[PDB]
């Protein structure tokens, strides 16, 4: 009763950080490749089609943050349980999250569906021009449970060191979505709604794999059954203690990017075009970090389960090192090949280079405050990972951008310095928790 992933988790923290992060970074990246595909197919459809997607953006990101957040709590809870050699607890978190996926998932469907037609009118939609917005959001919400179930299944797997089969789910989902996108949109001639049916149908297949894995094959470490089910008030508090603040965190990172564009619109439209494009390019370097963060949580949780800080500190500190040296390469590439990177994303070329030479430099500082939030979720304290994210993106990143604006260079100058301070605050606070554990 011990799989390969468990032996990684219950082993050398340095070995665990790497061999879990790589397939995660892969999985995180292959799905980003989809967003670029679906990004270029939808573009050619016309002005009217992009207006339905952009309106269906908050509801999508809203139910992605929820699904992913619940998965983070699941991943962290199972990881901590397995670290403490508690199978009976680990098996019981897997079942608890599966029921929560049903509750959270379907509720998202039945709550949003009757409210989706007023959402558009509230924003000021015409009724015929944005009549696709309701049709696009209808298809996605019809699988809002599948999205959550997929995330939970992914959270269950990476929570027991099974990042390889977790990667498979991310690839199979993005791959099918990639091949069905041109067929549904263009070949079958469904238009923008075809992209929704492609995403829907692809997630169904992923769940079929996920279900086959932990319901049919059952070749996973944990045992999933209801035969002697014990509804726990503690496991429920556990998953939500990380999950709920995780959902708000993923929202806050993008709910602050709006204010950054507001400081770009105030300093106007030609400036917002420069900011948005430069931001999209620079933010691509976050994808490798996200994998490291997903791997950090899994290993600092197992170390917290094994109750030894030297392992928890090693994995969390090793995580920063690799993420530092990964961004070191990324930043250099973007700064050196700036005109080359601009050409592909601009089909304002001069103002973009002025950004892509200064702005991306904050990517190097990021891993400090990010691995800390990751291990904060690893030990189970998500409320601290949330308040550190609020401090970073909304308080410092935005606050400095407004302090410099009251030209356009002050926007990147605010984002960098604001994220520089937040990294310093984040790393120190992460260190303090370690010493507090060493004294516990």
């Amino acid at each position: 009763k011990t799989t390969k992933g468990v032996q990684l988790l219950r082993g050398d923290p340095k070995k665990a950080i790497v061999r879990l992060s790589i397939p995660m970074m892969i999985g995180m990246s292959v799905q980003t490749l989809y967003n670029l595909a679906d990004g270029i197919w939808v573009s050619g459809l016309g002005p009217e089609s992009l207006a339905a997607v952009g309106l269906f953006f908050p509801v999508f990101m809203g139910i992605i943050a929820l699904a992913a957040g619940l998965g983070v709590g699941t991943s962290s809870a199972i990881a901590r349980r397995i670290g403490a050699r508690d199978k009976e607890g680990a098996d019981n978190v897997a079942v608890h999250s599966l029921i929560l996926s049903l509750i959270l998932g379907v509720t998202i469907t039945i709550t949003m569906l009757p409210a989706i037609d007023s959402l558009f009118r509230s924003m000021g939609a015409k009724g015929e021009a944005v009549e696709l917005a309701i049709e696009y959001a209808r298809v996605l919400l019809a699988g809002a449970f599948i999205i959550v179930f997929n995330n939970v299944g992914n959270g269950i797997l990476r929570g027991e060191g099974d990042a390889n089969r977790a990667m498979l789910a991310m690839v199979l989902g993005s791959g099918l979505n990639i091949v069905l996108d041109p067929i549904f949109i263009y070949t079958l001639g469904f238009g923008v709604v075809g992209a929704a049916y492609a995403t829907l149908l692809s997630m169904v297949v992923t769940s079929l794999f996920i279900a086959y894995w932990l319901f049919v094959k059952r070749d996973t470490y944990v045992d999933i059954t209801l035969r002697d089910f014990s509804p726990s008030r503690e496991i429920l508090k556990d998953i939500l203690r990380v999950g709920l603040p995780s959902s708000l965190s993923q929202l806050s990172m993008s709910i602050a990017m709006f204010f950054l564009n507001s400081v770009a619109i105030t300093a106007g439209e030609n400036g917002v075009a420069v900011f948005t494009s430069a931001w999209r390019i620079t933010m691509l370097g976050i994808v490798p970090i996200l994998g490291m963060a997903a791997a950090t949580t899994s290993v600092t949780g197992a170390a917290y389960g094994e109750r030894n800080v030297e392992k928890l500190e090693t994995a969390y500190l090793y995580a920063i090192k690799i993420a530092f040296m990964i961004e070191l390469a990324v930043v250099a590439f973007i700064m050196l090949f700036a005109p080359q990177v601009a050409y592909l994303f601009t089909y304002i070329k001069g103002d973009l280079i002025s950004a892509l030479r200064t702005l991306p430099v904050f990517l190097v500082l990021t891993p400090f405050g990010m691995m800390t939030s990751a291990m904060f979720q690893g030990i189970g304290e998500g409320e601290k990972s949330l308040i550190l994210t609020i401090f970073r993106t909304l308080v410092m990143q935005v606050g400095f951008a407004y302090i410099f604006v009251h030209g356009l260079r002050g926007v990147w100058i605010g984002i960098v310095i604001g994220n520089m301070v937040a990294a310093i605050v984040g790393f120190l606070w992460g260190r303090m928790r370690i010493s507090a554990l060493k004294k516990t």
Binding site: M28, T32, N35, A68, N151, G173, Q250, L251, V287
Partner: peptide, 11 residues
């Protein structure tokens, strides 16, 4: 993408 985080991070 979907699993996990947000991301996108693209339009």
């Amino acid at each position: 993408x979907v699993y996990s985080a947000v991301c996108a991070a693209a339009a």
